[PDB]
Amino acid sequence: SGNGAQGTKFRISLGLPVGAIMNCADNSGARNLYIIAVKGSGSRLNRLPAASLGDMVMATVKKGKPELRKKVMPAIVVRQAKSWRRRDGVFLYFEDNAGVIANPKGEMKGSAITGPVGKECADLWPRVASNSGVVV
Amino acid sequence: KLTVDITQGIPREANISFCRNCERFLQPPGQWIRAELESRELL
């Protein structure tokens, strides 16, 4: 919610610590994404920094094509299993955690994104909403 | 075609340690080395 991010995100619950493996929503070779760090996190002794829907995270490709493996690179989270309230009222949650691989400007490397995407991820990143099939 | 990329990555400023009496240069492990400037400290 900052690195060339078009908008200010309202706080939503965290369900993706460091060490999580979310799936790869885009179609640029990678299968799943091992989060190592979350861009714009705070600091507290002993607290693990944790991502949410719409945050940009640094990641490695643990399962996928060999060109993407063995390199830390950025990535954006497009779905979540930990439920969150919306200002309108409802608590909602997708079936799984998933994200797309993207460069530090916030642009897409893939051409299309399978499954649904959050509305809160779409507003924030224009090139994610460009390549989306569904939005919520 | 050229003059596009940054190809930076590596930091522009860095540190080295030096014994002032003996005239030796520190390494990241325990090695102290013997190099009176010139070709060795380049490497």
Binding site: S83, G89, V90, F91, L92, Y93, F94, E95, D96, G115, P116, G133, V134, V136 | -
Partner: protein
Amino acid sequence: MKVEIDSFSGAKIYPGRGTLFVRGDSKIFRFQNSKSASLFKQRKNPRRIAWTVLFRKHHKKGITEEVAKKRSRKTVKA
């Protein structure tokens, strides 16, 4: 303001109440409470649960309102 209905049973859900579930194939389910939501995770059929609207509509339970007669006819002629 809007009032959406429950996916499992059939009851109405007033604002700020119950969960919502976006499935992996882009489909949206609303629940009034964790009873209807736990029966969804357990893989239960709502046509066989006595207390649901999908049960009581299929079995003709309390059909005196629906089955009763009512006036509906006209004839202008011109």
